Amino acid sequence: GIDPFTMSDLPCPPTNAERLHEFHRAIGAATPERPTPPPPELLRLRQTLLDEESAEVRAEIDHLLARQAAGEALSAGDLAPLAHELADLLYVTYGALDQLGIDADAVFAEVHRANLSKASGPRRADGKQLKPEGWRPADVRGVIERLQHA
Amino acid sequence: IDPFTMPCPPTNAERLHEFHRAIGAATPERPTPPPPELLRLRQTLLDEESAEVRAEIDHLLARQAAGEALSAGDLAPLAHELADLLYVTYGALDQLGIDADAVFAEVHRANLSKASGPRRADGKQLKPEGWRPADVRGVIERLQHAPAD
């Protein structure tokens, strides 16, 4: 029940995943709330966008590396194109999850849990990260199942 | 400053900063030119996860080509790999000291603005009058001179 005294501006920004949902509504493509098997044309589209942005990211990394090989000292400002493309890559990665009706935050949270837990393990003498006692793998199947009934 | 003096939920970019603390990795608060070894490592990780995503998409398409209806659970391996790709993509921005949420906000702004334009007869999105591209160089500069953490 909201009222004349209510604050409408939320005190926390939408997530990047929430931004994609808003973007898809804007382009007239309002996407599902729950995991939804896609037609093949949607899967081809998503793969095309990933390949495009991944190719742009690789070109910016290559360009920075070529300049370092030539003896150049990079500046913070030199990173803008790489930063821009890494963000474009997040955009189309989130974009794919959103078009699948899969909440990207819920899946990321489960991956993160497993990765963070693995980070609490010891290192092998050569530096390789080992798993700690009690380690449990990411259960993304369980996450997709929950999302279908939440 | 008193006992009355007394906090938003963590974002995925913030999860990477936490992870990098936990593995003891390079993760400056502000944008920082990386050594070449770091750039080669981030590229390898992107290549690995994007290869894994491509394999899951190819598997789904092959099953659809055979006449199969996919289930929601069939999407679990693809979703897992897309999230792994987010992890190493945010990972790269974090190791660069660049606030991924700040850069993304700016890209979102330009993309959402473009979305408001008309479409060509063939469906191609056009820009509206007054559209402004993403100014990431402006974001980076702001991050260099923002107040301290």
Ligand SMILES: [Mn+2]
């Ligand atoms: Mn791009």
Ligand SMILES: [Mn+2]
């Ligand atoms: Mn993976």
Ligand SMILES: [Mn+2]
């Ligand atoms: Mn920051």
